Ligand SMILES: *[C@@H]1O[C@H](CO)[C@@H](O[C@@H]2O[C@H](CO)[C@@H](O)[C@H](O)[C@H]2NC(C)=O)[C@H](O)[C@H]1NC(C)=O
Ligand SMILES: *[C@@H]1O[C@H](CO)[C@@H](O)[C@H](O)[C@H]1NC(C)=O
Ligand SMILES: *[C@@H]1O[C@H](CO)[C@@H](O)[C@H](O)[C@H]1NC(C)=O
Ligand SMILES: *[C@@H]1O[C@H](CO)[C@@H](O)[C@H](O)[C@H]1NC(C)=O
Ligand SMILES: *[C@@H]1O[C@H](CO)[C@@H](O)[C@H](O)[C@H]1NC(C)=O
C-alpha cells in the first residue's frame with residue numbers, strides 16, 4: 001500500500017544527502 | 032624521429048626529479064600505500080563491459096570464436112599500451128593534458144580528445160548504473176515484480192503483451208522503460224527514472240568530492256565486494272541443471288568466423304575498452320607515485336588480472352544462459368508430449384523424451400485424419416543457446432528470469448545487483464579523473480575556489496544532460512550513442528599515444544628514463560612491440576572500421592506491440608538526422624587532434 005521501492009529509495013537517498021553535508025563541513029572544519 | 036627543438040627546459044631533467052619530488056609534499060596529492068594504487072587501477076578497468084559488451088559480442092562472432100582474436104590482440108596492443116601509460120606519467124609528473132603538451136605544443140589535441148571521450152562515455156555509462164539502482168530498489172519483496180503478469184481492467188486475463196511475450200519483458204520494456212515504437216517520437220521525462228538518475232549522480236559526488244583521499248577508502252570497500260560476490264555466484268551457477276552446456280557453447284569455436292574483418296574490429300575495440308586506455312585516467316593515477324617505483328611490475332600484474340577476470344565473468348554468464356536454454360527446451364519439449372497424449376488419449380507414464388520419435392509415427396498409422404490437425408513444435412538446442420542477448424538484455428532479461436527459479440530468490444537479486452552497482456561505480460571513479468584534471472589544467476576556473484566546487488559543478492551539468500536518456504525513446508539513444516562513442520574514439524587516441532612517444536619524444540631517450548627509475552632497460556619483448564608490431568596492428572584495426580562502416584545498413588531493434596509476429600526481433604532503419612548525431616559523437620574527438628595541430632601550425636605560419 002505504498003510501493004516498497006519508494007521506501008528503499010527514501011532511506012538510500014537520505015543516507016547520501018546527509019553524507020555530503022558531513023564531507024563538506026569536514027573539509028571546511030579542516031582547512 | 033624529429034629532433035623536437037626545445038624538448039629540454041620544458042620537462043624535468045633526470046636529476047631534478049629527486050629534488051622536485053621532495054617539494055611536492057603540499058601541492059600534488061599522494062597515495063597512502065601501494066595497495067591503494069593497485070586497487071584504484073584494477074577497479075577502473077573491471078566491470079560493466081565484462082557483463083554487457085563481452086557476451087553480446089561473443090555470440091555473434093562465432094559463438095565462442097571471439098576469445099582467440101581477443102586474447103591475441105590483448106597481448107599485442109593491450110600490454111604494450113598499458114605499460115607505456117604507467118611510465119610516461121610517472122616521469123613527466125603531469126596529468127593527461129600536461130604530458131602531451133610537453134612533447135611538442137602541437138599534440139595538445141590528445142589531451143582535449145581524452146577529456147571529450149571521458150565525458151561522453153561517462154554520460155551514458157552512469158545511466159546504466161541508474162537502471163541497476165532501479166532494480167536494486169525493486170527487491171526486498173518475495174513475489175518479485177518481474178515474476179508475474181498484471182491483470183486487465185476486467186480481472187479475467189493477463190495483459191495482451193504480457194501473454195505473448197515473457198513477464199520479464201513486461202517489466203523492462205513497459206514498466207521500467209515505457210519504451211516507444213521509434214526513435215523519432217519521444218514522450219515525457221518519466222519521473223521514476225529521474226529519481227534514480229539523481230541518486231546515481233549524488234552517490235558519485237559523495238565519493239569523489241575531493242579527488243584522491245576520498246576515492247581511497249571507497250576503492251577499498253568496492254574492490255572487495257565485486258570480487259567476493261562473483262565467487263559466491265560461481266558455485267551456484269555450476270550447480271544448476273542446464274549448466275556445463277552454455278560453457279561448451281562458449282568454447283566450441285567456429286573457425287570460419289576468424290576470417291572476417293568485423294570480428295577483429297570488435298575484438299580490437301574491446302581491448303581498449305576493457306583496459307581503460309586512451310582515457311587519460313591511468314596517466315593521472317600513475318603521476319602520484321614516487322619516481323623510483325617499479326612501473327613494469329605494475330603493468331604486467333594489472334594486465335593478468337584484467338585478462339583472467341574477463342574469462343572468469345564469461346563462464347559465470349554463460350552458465351546461466353545454458354540454464355535458460357534447458358528450462359526452455361524442457362518446456363517446449365513438454366508441449367509436444369502433452370499435445371500428443373491429449374489428442375489420442377494416452378496415459379502420462381508412456382510418452383517421454385526417450386521415445387517421442389517412436390510413438391508419433393504410431394499415431395499417423397492409426398488415425399491419419401485425427402493426426403493432421405495436431406501441431407508439433409520444432410525446437411532443439413543451439414537455437415535456444417543463440418538468441419537476442421543484445422545490449423541491456425542480459426542483466427535484465429536473462430539473469431532476472433533465472434533468479435526467480437532459485438530458492439530464496441530475493442537474496443540472489445540483492446547480492447547480484449549490489450555487485451553490479453559496485454562494478455559500475457568503481458569505474459566511474461577514474462572516469463571522473465579524466466574530466467576533472469585536464470579541466471583544472473586549462474585555467475578556466477579561478478584557482479581560489481576549492482576542489483569540491485568544480486567537481487560538483489561538472490556533476491550537475493552531466494545530470495542535466497542525462498535527461499535525454501529518461502524519455503520514452505531513451506533506450507534507442509543509449510544504444511547508438513554507446514556503440515559509436517565507444518568504438519571509434521578509442522582506437523584513434525590509442526594510436527596517437529603509441530606514435531608520439533616512440534617517434535616524437537624518442538624511444539631511445541625513453542629507455543634512459545626507464546633505466547633511471549626501475550633500474551634496467553626494457554627487454555627485447557618491449558622493443559619489438561613498441562616500434563614495429565603494435566603501431567601496425569592498430570594502424571590496421573583502423574582500416575577495418577571503414578571496411579565495415581560502408582557495406583552495412585544502420586538498423587536497430589524495435590519493440591512495437593502491434594507488429595505481427597511480435598516477440599521476435601524487428602529491425603528498421605535509422606532516420607536521416609542520425610548522421611548529425613553520429614558525426615558529433617565520433618567526430619569532435621578525432622577532428623580535435625588534427626584540429627589543434629592545424630591551429631598551432633597556423634599560429635606559426
Ligand atoms: C560459422 O560462421 C560462418 C560465418 O558467419 C557462418 O556462415 C554464415 O551462415 C549464415 C546462415 O547460414 C549465412 O547467412 C552467411 O552468409 C554465412 N557466412 C558466410 C561468410 O557465408 C556459419 O553458419 C557459422 N557456423 C554455424 C554452425 O553456424
Ligand atoms: C472492462 O471493464 C471496464 C470497467 O472499468 C469497462 O469500461 C470495459 O468496457 C470492459 N471491457 C469489456 C471488453 O467488457
Ligand atoms: C507511459 O506510462 C504512462 C503512465 O504511467 C502512460 O500514460 C503512457 O501512455 C505510457 N507511454 C507509452 C508510450 O505507452
Ligand atoms: C505405455 O503403453 C504401451 C502400450 O500398452 C507400452 O508398450 C509401453 O511400454 C508403455 N510405457 C511405459 C510402461 O512406460
Ligand atoms: C504421417 O505423417 C508423417 C509425417 O509427420 C508421414 O511421414 C507419414 O507418411 C504419414 N502417414 C500417413 C499414413 O499418411
Ligand SMILES: CC(C)C[C@H](N)C(=O)O
Nearest residue numbers: 075076077080304458462
Ligand atoms: C567508464 C569506462 C572508463 C569504464 C571502462 N571502459 C571499463 O569498462 O572498465
